[PDB]
């Protein structure tokens, strides 16, 4: 049966009041930002975002440099292959030339020695003949 | 004059704004083109609508989104002549469900433009009360852009009230896995800048649409029309010459005993299907009893597990004080209704004579009398606990955190936001101890 | 978040890409000449995501067609929708990559890559709001794999803030074109781990097995394999092309699907499984069940061998949204042991009224499952069997590559497997 | 576009070139005068075009004696080649590697290189060189080695692939052919990328068994060799369903630089008589490739392991039928692969059926296939050759003929030690992994 | 490798040389005036190997005719085909070497050698691509043996890179009574071992034995012996004279036949054996390869092993049958071939048979059994040299005894080298 009704306000399209069933056990109701602060925090976040985008691009730049180093390495290997094939072949053709000329000279010197022996035979025949009877 | 500026942020905020402003137009007799053949009777509608040199009435509102699709529907739809193009503001790319993207990356490029528009609306006010901000906790814009805007609004309008209508995330209609992160992050940054926040859990409204309106799979159009009904009930005494919650400061006075515990529970009745066969009108006793039923709440939580620190009954329509007092007397007789020891057990009651209005062709039946209860109960801490637990499960593994860190946020901000919500949970416990 | 720029590289990339353009053109009511002749507004609402509007109401795919060899280009131009493509968007070399990742990535591919970037730059600069890039390619050859990954890193450098998405075809000895596929695939996975945001793993092992075991095709062809891929790609892109709330753009999809940056490899699923000559039913409970069926996965992994970190489920056709919601809740509750408990509400569902070309009802699952580690282990075992003996290595080192790149790619792929295993074993009670 | 330069060296290389270029002309509709009436323009890889519309082979024919090349110069196709691409000296290498490489070859090598340089100048996308020669002749062995070395200096690592005739006693012209074969293999090993060996005894026996020819002549052997060469080059000269270029042959067939000798197998080989031959399916012609009687080199693949198999199909062949045939081959226990090869199959398909020379021994078939397989069984051919070398070299028999030309005995030891290492390389490569 | 320059020295050399020119002229369709009246294009395809084309379509043998005696020239000019030879190519002295190798090599022969080189240089320099030289001579007299070997070393000095080939007639006590034939033959073998690339050993002992035992000629003459030589020479030069794959030139033949530089002495074989007044099957022809009765060197091929063999089949016969029979003859007789020279038997088939026959077989064998021919000469040499008999015939011409000991040692070393390879195993 206990209910304290208290009229609050009355107006053109409304009416208000407070209904109190029981008063409180404990008497009494007990038991700034700045543009600069905001801006400083937003700009610090922007710098972290830009720093990580820069790190991503720095790594992509490192991949582009590596790509250039593999193209260069393949070019250098092809050039060293050419250089080695060229001097191996020049060495082989020159050794072969020295050898073939040496074999030809040795066999011609053998035939030339036969000619020296032949004139020496001719010499003895001549003194056997003539200087007789 | 007591003008209020409405700020609709992101998809949820903008789509709820479409529903609210459509209902206000119907309630004040304003046509979609801004014309008014002056129904209502009084000129209090001027708190929410300014007037142009051609006799048109224009909402004191700003619609903002980081993407243009949703606001483009407002720019080209039924109410395109109701708003001037300068109050419909959009960027090109959204916040991709990421608070850090909305707060630190994309929001930063449109915030000055939004503040400039708000300043031009404030210049047309002789007695600016403050702001009503509509947004979701879950979206990247609703979370990140709203908190960024709240901070600047505190710098530019220190002694002005800021009231929120916030959408609490629900898996049935959820758009992102990271919604618990966005919710805890935005609550942390907004806590000290907001004066009073009316949370609406999509699951509670979704279940009310299924149970009370017989809608199998409710859409955002169904949910928002019901949200509009609740928002209209809460703003009715600012837009009509009412007697309770006559100014925005009165909301903090009547519902908020401590600055951090500013999340009142909303309950609404009756919610009846338009397609229902000619039913008899519900009495003041029946709609009052429905106020004390968990199934009619805007947030899923158990008031039996908590204590009330303030209670406001906003009746609307064919309602007489004698019938209200008789209804409240029976409820105290059969129910406990435990109040904290430092607050009196009782209610602040308001009757707004203007009838409840429904959108023609909508899902809601036109009723002779309705009631909206706003109660600050410690039981709402259950919604924070559910959200905090989901945050903890993911954050223990640092799941999805790289998305926020990649936008310039630090891990410490996640710890700070979570520690602040742990303090909020302890505050509800301490405040409701005796 | 409007435009997507599509790139197709190499034979496989251009074959599945032409098939993607042919299916989505039919769904959007676009004929072989680029003319719109549909009867629904949902078909044109988001047409600009994939098509440019040219003079005279014609729609032209925002697609760049790439190869180091011209034969593929000729076959696409000659194909059913070949005339729809922008002629200047066909970028091709004359040499070929010789099935060698190193030629595609460092030598011949590097010589053609700037001609490709000039064409994708023209498409990108024309965008009002570029979402990012979509690449179709195989990982087993030289062009799609080597040059495709070279393109990704070059695009990452010029568009670091855009989403990079791939449809990557994983090789299988069951339907193989070259002996060095495990090398080309491992070197590409290494690149994808570091430079893509979302990768759909389209496994030829899984496609061959669906055709052989389920469709009863004794000898499956690329046509049979590509029919499953085209339905899958139509399914995974549904939310990018039609009006809807969930995963409507490449970044919102990435935020919902990718909890850890390196774990961005998706296991696509599709139901019903059909052949090009096709049953006549499939109900909502039947469609939801296929989410855990290894037989319905486009990656040769068993979803019941691991746990789903995240899932996107797309249902298409005339079906009850209420029934889909009830069945998706039941499939999660009954199979709680196959979802990580520390990512709450990790399954997101979408329903679209327009079914894929040729079907009345369908389901597509985009899964981020720890079971994908089985696909990487399979590639790794094939890689090690060759690398242990240094077989075919002189073809890569002859292109300037070092042996260290192989060991690094192998380590990164094994670390990825070890990461998936770590989250598979992780409990909520740390 | 993707040009291939052909070099035909010595009697065997030149006579096989006569058969190949005659067959290419028949396959592309090129008349003996180089004219072609009024498409697939891939033949441009092997034929250049003059201002008068005449198609000219991208080829050089070289011999140290003029007799064999004189037949080209005065025959049916004398207008097809310009006289400057048919190069001959006066005196041959007398079955001596040393005379081909040094004494006689060094006099004409600069002229041959000058002509190849003029052909390379007409190439916009030179793929490399196809060198046709015997292992046994003094020119085929010695001049080819010298030319290979000079091509590595002028073109670096540009692809160099061979078609080499392995010696057979039935048609052998010299006792010293094992010496000429070992010396040329040693010199050429590091300069060649891939060598397709053809054993004359195997082609001789195929002509006797499959074509019913009592005593096969070089005309019979060469027409069959031309068929195999045409099959290997059909993927370069036509654009079929699946193509394989010079680079793809190398990458798929050569796992290690020295292991570059694929075995050639061809099917079907049917006599122009019979008539009741009933058309052989893709499965039947594929199965025939793994039958020893169809191999171009005498060796037993059952005694070895496959490391790579390239299938070159031509005619009425569909990819589905090829995959079905290769799948049954993968289930054959008697066809063993090395454990370090997960899959060793490269397939190429061309629509153009095998064209036969009018009045030849071969029947017109609807479909044919040429398999290029890297098998460790091919080491049997090297062992056979190495043993004959050892028998003679232990006594220094015939060595004075090479020494007299400037060669040293140390070159014989080095060449033999290199071939001993090659034999051990086939043994190591066929071993299972630990 | 086109032109061959032929030289014939002394009586024997000019008698077998005139016979060679008469047989190959008939085979190539060339009459006694040098006119071509053949029927086949195979006859003229390689006509330039042995003949020059003179004014008016006539063919003239690239032959130089040499003798220290001027009667041999007259008899050749008077013989059948005498008018075919170039008149200025007849180079003759007046003295005669008196069956003395020293007179031929050092005295009278040295006085005539420059007149011969005048004529062979003119022939050799006129060649487009000179293969080398072919010499017919005997080893038992003075001109053919002494002057013939002097010519070889002089031509070798001027043309060191050309092939030097000889048809060397070995003496026998059965046909000639000249006592010093063992000396002239040993001094010539010494020269041939060091300066020729290929030498066909035409043994008068073997020729006499075929005529006496097989042809039943009680008293054979040089005409009877030379008929076997002309058929043999037509047979061994078949591959130089007609289009073909095998041993088509003097250097390719040497490379196939000569495994060791000194072992270049060939044992020629021929089937069928005919007289000047008298067709075998393929198996019958192949069997004669191991028949001592068919050898033109008095050695038994079954007494040694073949290092290398060239088998030439002529006439209309099956190449398939020849191939089958040649494989059977080496499989059944594997012990008579050295195992360490694989595929050492090369076969050739020519459609044109020799003059007077329908089918023939010629075998060019490099057999270790040839050491029996050298041992026979060596025993005859030692029987005389041991007593220094007739030495003043050679020392009177300026020679030293040391040249004899050296020639003897070199010939015994040659025998010892054939024996070494005969006994050698593959092991
Ligand atoms: N699902 C499909 N896989 C394909 C198709 N074509 C090829 N592939 C697979 O792709 C892999 C390599 O084939 P490609 O033709 O794409 C090689 P690509 O052109 O990119 O480079 P190159 O090696 O330079 O030729 C291998 O695993 C094949 O089985 C196709 O149409 N569908
Ligand atoms: N088979 C042949 N052997 C012959 C012929 N003429 C001679 N001879 C043999 O040659 C040897 C004697 O040589 P020659 O008569 O040629 C002596 P040549 O003229 O060369 O020198 P000189 O008479 O000493 O001046 C001796 O063994 C004879 O039996 C012949 O026509 N055929
Ligand atoms: N009641 C209601 N909730 C909505 C509506 N639209 C979205 N939501 C909810 O809001 C959350 C998602 O936030 P949104 O407002 O769509 O996102 P946003 O603010 O536009 O942010 P971004 O799109 O990320 O830039 C989810 O919980 C949705 O269920 C709406 O019209 N009504
Ligand atoms: N298949 C085939 N093999 C041949 C042909 N001609 C020769 N040969 C073989 O090649 C080898 C001999 O080499 P050739 O090519 O004739 O000699 P060459 O290269 O001309 O060298 P030289 O004549 O010594 O300067 C033997 O094994 C012959 O059987 C031919 O037309 N076809
Ligand atoms: Mg939004
Ligand atoms: Mg390709
Ligand atoms: Mg030759
Ligand atoms: Mg005389």
XYZ file of N, CA and C in Angstrom, chain D residues 254-410:
471
model
N 67.143 -34.332 -69.934
C 68.520 -34.373 -69.409
C 68.620 -34.006 -67.930
N 68.648 -35.003 -67.025
C 68.696 -34.655 -65.592
C 70.049 -34.169 -65.082
N 71.126 -34.541 -65.758
C 72.512 -34.192 -65.408
C 73.211 -33.873 -66.721
N 74.122 -32.900 -66.743
C 74.740 -32.493 -68.033
C 75.357 -33.608 -68.883
N 76.074 -34.565 -68.267
C 76.705 -35.646 -69.042
C 75.727 -36.746 -69.471
N 74.596 -36.859 -68.757
C 73.581 -37.894 -68.996
C 72.623 -37.340 -70.018
N 73.112 -37.152 -71.259
C 72.316 -36.491 -72.292
C 72.075 -37.337 -73.538
N 71.969 -38.661 -73.386
C 71.800 -39.553 -74.531
C 70.467 -40.308 -74.497
N 69.347 -39.682 -74.938
C 68.077 -40.411 -74.960
C 68.037 -41.521 -76.017
N 67.337 -42.587 -75.746
C 67.102 -43.710 -76.638
C 65.901 -43.341 -77.516
N 65.981 -43.584 -78.818
C 64.863 -43.313 -79.722
C 64.098 -44.605 -80.055
N 62.777 -44.566 -79.964
C 61.925 -45.707 -80.307
C 60.849 -45.161 -81.243
N 60.482 -45.924 -82.268
C 59.493 -45.459 -83.238
C 58.485 -46.537 -83.599
N 57.212 -46.140 -83.743
C 56.154 -47.062 -84.126
C 54.969 -46.313 -84.767
N 54.265 -46.935 -85.732
C 54.500 -48.272 -86.295
C 55.353 -48.242 -87.567
N 56.119 -49.314 -87.802
C 56.934 -49.459 -89.010
C 56.293 -50.603 -89.788
N 55.487 -50.268 -90.797
C 54.753 -51.253 -91.582
C 55.190 -51.233 -93.043
N 55.289 -52.419 -93.650
C 55.662 -52.574 -95.048
C 54.599 -51.987 -95.961
N 55.038 -51.284 -97.025
C 54.146 -50.711 -98.026
C 53.285 -51.802 -98.717
N 53.606 -53.098 -98.518
C 52.797 -54.222 -98.985
C 51.697 -54.488 -97.888
N 51.318 -55.769 -97.661
C 50.377 -56.239 -96.641
C 48.894 -55.843 -96.896
N 48.551 -54.522 -96.833
C 47.206 -53.933 -96.999
C 46.250 -54.230 -95.832
N 46.293 -55.459 -95.289
C 45.458 -55.885 -94.160
C 46.120 -55.521 -92.817
N 46.795 -54.361 -92.769
C 47.509 -53.911 -91.589
C 46.614 -53.474 -90.432
N 45.277 -53.274 -90.654
C 44.309 -52.815 -89.625
C 44.879 -51.645 -88.777
N 44.263 -50.431 -88.811
C 44.878 -49.281 -88.125
C 45.111 -49.474 -86.623
N 46.385 -49.283 -86.227
C 46.853 -49.397 -84.855
C 46.382 -48.202 -84.019
N 45.862 -48.480 -82.822
C 45.373 -47.473 -81.889
C 46.527 -46.742 -81.186
N 46.203 -45.672 -80.429
C 47.178 -44.909 -79.648
C 47.797 -45.830 -78.576
N 46.969 -46.682 -77.936
C 47.451 -47.624 -76.927
C 48.459 -48.607 -77.522
N 48.141 -49.215 -78.691
C 49.023 -50.145 -79.401
C 50.350 -49.522 -79.819
N 50.346 -48.296 -80.379
C 51.605 -47.655 -80.787
C 52.427 -47.209 -79.563
N 51.760 -46.906 -78.433
C 52.436 -46.507 -77.201
C 53.125 -47.721 -76.577
N 52.423 -48.862 -76.538
C 52.962 -50.119 -76.016
C 54.209 -50.548 -76.814
N 54.168 -50.375 -78.149
C 55.270 -50.706 -79.052
C 56.557 -49.930 -78.716
N 56.457 -48.749 -78.110
C 57.631 -47.955 -77.745
C 58.504 -48.579 -76.652
N 57.896 -49.380 -75.796
C 58.626 -50.050 -74.732
C 59.038 -51.472 -75.098
N 58.855 -51.871 -76.372
C 59.302 -53.145 -76.901
C 60.691 -52.956 -77.519
N 61.680 -53.735 -77.032
C 63.056 -53.616 -77.560
C 63.232 -53.691 -79.072
N 62.383 -54.468 -79.782
C 62.479 -54.614 -81.238
C 62.211 -53.329 -82.027
N 61.598 -52.308 -81.395
C 61.300 -51.034 -82.059
C 62.310 -49.917 -81.753
N 63.326 -50.204 -80.914
C 64.371 -49.245 -80.548
C 65.369 -48.979 -81.650
N 65.881 -47.775 -81.687
C 66.882 -47.350 -82.633
C 68.301 -47.693 -82.141
N 68.502 -48.098 -80.870
C 69.793 -48.498 -80.300
C 69.594 -49.866 -79.656
N 70.512 -50.809 -79.912
C 70.445 -52.116 -79.288
C 70.923 -52.038 -77.853
N 69.999 -52.276 -76.925
C 70.194 -52.283 -75.480
C 68.907 -52.820 -74.846
N 69.019 -53.280 -73.603
C 67.896 -53.878 -72.908
C 67.385 -52.967 -71.803
N 66.241 -52.278 -72.002
C 65.713 -51.392 -70.956
C 65.279 -52.094 -69.687
N 65.044 -53.409 -69.749
C 64.711 -54.174 -68.556
C 65.943 -54.207 -67.596
N 67.176 -54.146 -68.139
C 68.429 -54.080 -67.367
C 68.753 -52.647 -66.846
N 67.845 -51.695 -67.043
C 68.071 -50.322 -66.634
C 66.851 -49.663 -66.037
N 66.939 -48.352 -65.865
C 65.844 -47.570 -65.309
C 65.650 -46.318 -66.133
N 64.398 -45.940 -66.342
C 64.038 -44.730 -67.061
C 64.161 -43.536 -66.144
N 64.671 -42.423 -66.664
C 64.738 -41.181 -65.893
C 63.867 -40.102 -66.516
N 63.459 -40.273 -67.793
C 62.643 -39.338 -68.539
C 62.150 -39.982 -69.830
N 60.905 -39.728 -70.176
C 60.286 -40.212 -71.396
C 59.513 -39.087 -72.055
N 59.855 -38.787 -73.286
C 59.194 -37.794 -74.111
C 58.467 -38.530 -75.243
N 57.167 -38.333 -75.356
C 56.353 -38.996 -76.361
C 55.967 -37.984 -77.406
N 56.362 -38.200 -78.656
C 56.010 -37.293 -79.744
C 55.040 -37.987 -80.697
N 53.756 -37.701 -80.552
C 52.702 -38.281 -81.382
C 52.422 -37.442 -82.597
N 51.938 -38.069 -83.671
C 51.549 -37.341 -84.865
C 50.446 -38.058 -85.614
N 49.518 -37.273 -86.135
C 48.376 -37.778 -86.888
C 47.069 -37.705 -86.129
N 46.172 -38.683 -86.367
C 44.861 -38.801 -85.726
C 45.015 -39.244 -84.258
N 45.465 -38.320 -83.392
C 45.759 -38.565 -81.981
C 45.110 -37.492 -81.108
N 44.356 -37.923 -80.105
C 43.663 -37.046 -79.163
C 44.270 -37.175 -77.742
N 44.435 -36.047 -77.018
C 45.060 -36.097 -75.683
C 44.474 -37.105 -74.697
N 43.156 -37.312 -74.723
C 42.495 -38.292 -73.864
C 43.053 -39.712 -74.122
N 43.249 -40.075 -75.409
C 43.762 -41.397 -75.771
C 45.233 -41.587 -75.365
N 46.012 -40.505 -75.402
C 47.411 -40.508 -74.983
C 47.539 -40.711 -73.471
N 46.756 -39.968 -72.677
C 46.772 -40.083 -71.219
C 46.357 -41.466 -70.750
N 45.359 -42.073 -71.414
C 44.898 -43.424 -71.094
C 46.015 -44.433 -71.362
N 46.753 -44.241 -72.473
C 47.844 -45.119 -72.853
C 49.020 -44.998 -71.884
N 49.418 -43.767 -71.519
C 50.505 -43.525 -70.560
C 50.136 -44.025 -69.143
N 48.847 -43.949 -68.765
C 48.405 -44.450 -67.468
C 48.626 -45.952 -67.378
N 48.337 -46.711 -68.465
C 48.565 -48.163 -68.433
C 50.076 -48.476 -68.374
N 50.918 -47.629 -68.989
C 52.385 -47.729 -68.973
C 52.946 -47.477 -67.558
N 52.305 -46.589 -66.791
C 52.693 -46.311 -65.409
C 52.422 -47.535 -64.467
N 51.487 -48.417 -64.849
C 51.175 -49.615 -64.068
C 52.025 -50.842 -64.465
N 53.023 -50.657 -65.337
C 53.870 -51.744 -65.771
C 55.116 -51.851 -64.920
N 55.113 -52.879 -64.086
C 56.161 -53.305 -63.167
C 57.486 -53.539 -63.911
N 57.410 -54.071 -65.148
C 58.572 -54.327 -65.995
C 59.188 -53.045 -66.597
N 58.509 -51.887 -66.466
C 59.001 -50.582 -66.920
C 59.350 -49.781 -65.655
N 60.616 -49.838 -65.245
C 61.066 -49.216 -64.010
C 61.685 -47.840 -64.190
N 61.315 -46.896 -63.298
C 61.847 -45.535 -63.271
C 62.767 -45.352 -62.066
N 63.726 -44.412 -62.141
C 64.581 -44.091 -61.001
C 63.687 -43.497 -59.877
N 64.020 -43.755 -58.604
C 63.184 -43.292 -57.498
C 63.190 -41.760 -57.329
N 64.186 -41.057 -57.911
C 64.223 -39.601 -57.844
C 63.420 -38.912 -58.955
N 62.552 -39.657 -59.637
C 61.728 -39.081 -60.678
C 60.250 -39.310 -60.414
N 59.555 -38.343 -59.788
C 58.122 -38.527 -59.489
C 57.248 -38.762 -60.724
N 57.591 -38.123 -61.845
C 56.876 -38.292 -63.117
C 57.820 -37.934 -64.255
N 58.016 -38.854 -65.187
C 58.938 -38.630 -66.294
C 58.304 -38.728 -67.661
N 57.227 -37.981 -67.895
C 56.518 -38.020 -69.161
C 56.231 -36.624 -69.723
N 56.827 -36.314 -70.888
C 56.602 -35.071 -71.619
C 55.893 -35.473 -72.912
N 54.683 -34.960 -73.161
C 53.919 -35.366 -74.339
C 53.792 -34.229 -75.340
N 53.881 -34.553 -76.620
C 53.708 -33.623 -77.722
C 52.816 -34.275 -78.757
N 51.807 -33.550 -79.258
C 50.875 -34.081 -80.244
C 50.743 -33.150 -81.442
N 50.940 -33.678 -82.652
C 50.776 -32.916 -83.888
C 49.717 -33.581 -84.752
N 48.909 -32.789 -85.448
C 47.798 -33.307 -86.240
C 48.210 -33.990 -87.552
N 49.395 -33.658 -88.074
C 49.921 -34.126 -89.359
C 50.432 -35.562 -89.346
N 49.713 -36.488 -90.007
C 50.158 -37.888 -90.029
C 51.492 -38.092 -90.737
N 52.202 -39.196 -90.422
C 53.493 -39.432 -91.074
C 53.381 -39.642 -92.571
N 53.973 -38.697 -93.264
C 54.087 -38.624 -94.705
C 55.180 -39.596 -95.116
N 54.926 -40.340 -96.184
C 55.914 -41.277 -96.688
C 56.361 -40.846 -98.094
N 57.643 -41.078 -98.400
C 58.211 -40.728 -99.690
C 57.591 -41.643 -100.734
N 57.038 -41.073 -101.829
C 56.435 -41.915 -102.883
C 57.427 -42.927 -103.430
N 57.001 -44.186 -103.467
C 57.833 -45.299 -103.908
C 58.730 -45.885 -102.830
N 58.559 -45.440 -101.582
C 59.350 -45.920 -100.455
C 58.883 -47.262 -99.913
N 59.540 -47.738 -98.859
C 59.249 -49.035 -98.235
C 58.153 -48.997 -97.148
N 57.877 -47.807 -96.607
C 56.919 -47.617 -95.517
C 55.482 -47.352 -95.952
N 54.545 -47.977 -95.251
C 53.127 -47.795 -95.483
C 52.612 -46.484 -94.858
N 51.490 -45.989 -95.388
C 50.785 -44.802 -94.925
C 50.018 -45.199 -93.664
N 50.324 -44.556 -92.532
C 49.626 -44.852 -91.284
C 48.847 -43.611 -90.786
N 47.723 -43.826 -90.075
C 46.871 -42.753 -89.557
C 47.499 -42.037 -88.355
N 48.315 -42.762 -87.573
C 48.964 -42.205 -86.396
C 50.274 -42.921 -86.106
N 51.253 -42.181 -85.619
C 52.570 -42.705 -85.288
C 53.138 -41.970 -84.044
N 54.181 -42.528 -83.430
C 54.772 -41.953 -82.243
C 56.271 -42.200 -82.195
N 56.994 -41.208 -81.695
C 58.419 -41.315 -81.495
C 58.714 -41.043 -80.034
N 59.299 -42.022 -79.350
C 59.633 -41.858 -77.956
C 61.099 -41.550 -77.810
N 61.413 -40.537 -77.000
C 62.764 -40.163 -76.653
C 62.864 -40.481 -75.164
N 63.616 -41.522 -74.793
C 63.699 -41.926 -73.397
C 65.105 -41.959 -72.847
N 65.330 -41.321 -71.700
C 66.630 -41.368 -71.062
C 66.626 -42.578 -70.150
N 67.339 -43.615 -70.534
C 67.395 -44.865 -69.766
C 68.848 -45.165 -69.438
N 69.121 -45.660 -68.226
C 70.479 -46.070 -67.863
C 70.927 -47.318 -68.683
N 69.992 -47.989 -69.417
C 70.268 -49.141 -70.280
C 71.151 -48.761 -71.461
N 71.096 -47.487 -71.902
C 71.928 -46.994 -72.990
C 73.420 -47.125 -72.661
N 73.806 -47.275 -71.377
C 75.193 -47.491 -70.965
C 75.755 -48.794 -71.518
N 74.881 -49.758 -71.930
C 75.264 -51.021 -72.574
C 75.937 -50.759 -73.920
N 75.462 -49.764 -74.670
C 76.024 -49.373 -75.954
C 77.430 -48.792 -75.736
N 77.620 -47.977 -74.677
C 78.928 -47.412 -74.366
C 79.890 -48.495 -73.929
N 79.417 -49.454 -73.131
C 80.244 -50.568 -72.659
C 80.761 -51.416 -73.822
N 79.900 -51.657 -74.815
C 80.188 -52.447 -76.007
C 81.317 -51.767 -76.813
N 81.192 -50.446 -76.993
C 82.124 -49.586 -77.703
C 83.453 -49.515 -76.931
N 83.395 -49.295 -75.603
C 84.572 -49.171 -74.748
C 85.411 -50.436 -74.727
N 84.767 -51.603 -74.776
C 85.458 -52.882 -74.783
C 86.277 -53.097 -76.072
N 85.699 -52.732 -77.224
C 86.355 -52.814 -78.519
C 87.560 -51.879 -78.542
N 87.426 -50.671 -77.947
C 88.488 -49.676 -77.807
C 89.644 -50.292 -77.024
N 89.348 -50.910 -75.860
C 90.324 -51.524 -74.963
C 91.092 -52.658 -75.590
N 90.405 -53.514 -76.377
C 91.047 -54.650 -77.049
C 92.152 -54.144 -77.992
N 91.833 -53.147 -78.821
C 92.783 -52.575 -79.765
C 93.861 -51.716 -79.095
N 93.454 -50.816 -78.159
C 94.356 -49.893 -77.472
C 95.371 -50.592 -76.578
N 95.040 -51.763 -76.008
C 96.023 -52.521 -75.216
C 97.274 -52.869 -76.050
N 97.104 -53.030 -77.362
C 98.220 -53.312 -78.260
C 98.720 -52.066 -79.006
N 98.085 -50.900 -78.818
C 98.359 -49.649 -79.533
C 98.099 -49.845 -81.049
N 97.164 -50.754 -81.412
C 96.846 -51.069 -82.800
C 96.204 -49.857 -83.460
N 96.704 -49.457 -84.635
C 96.240 -48.342 -85.450
C 96.531 -46.957 -84.867
N 97.061 -46.875 -83.631
C 97.341 -45.611 -82.932
C 98.344 -44.735 -83.706
N 99.286 -45.362 -84.422
C 100.274 -44.635 -85.210
C 99.645 -43.713 -86.279
N 98.426 -44.028 -86.745
C 97.731 -43.209 -87.726
C 97.295 -41.856 -87.120
N 96.945 -41.849 -85.844
C 96.498 -40.661 -85.127
C 97.706 -39.873 -84.656
N 98.737 -40.560 -84.140
C 99.982 -39.955 -83.678
C 100.711 -39.255 -84.835
N 100.697 -39.868 -86.021
C 101.288 -39.296 -87.229
C 100.652 -37.981 -87.651
N 99.398 -37.744 -87.227
C 98.672 -36.505 -87.513
C 98.813 -35.431 -86.415
N 99.660 -35.676 -85.413
C 99.925 -34.725 -84.344
C 99.231 -35.013 -83.023
N 98.412 -36.063 -82.983
C 97.729 -36.453 -81.756
C 98.709 -37.123 -80.829
N 98.438 -37.066 -79.540
C 99.282 -37.707 -78.539
C 98.529 -38.881 -77.951
N 99.270 -39.887 -77.469
C 98.685 -41.064 -76.830
C 97.862 -40.695 -75.587
N 98.253 -39.615 -74.889
C 97.568 -39.098 -73.710
C 96.127 -38.708 -73.978
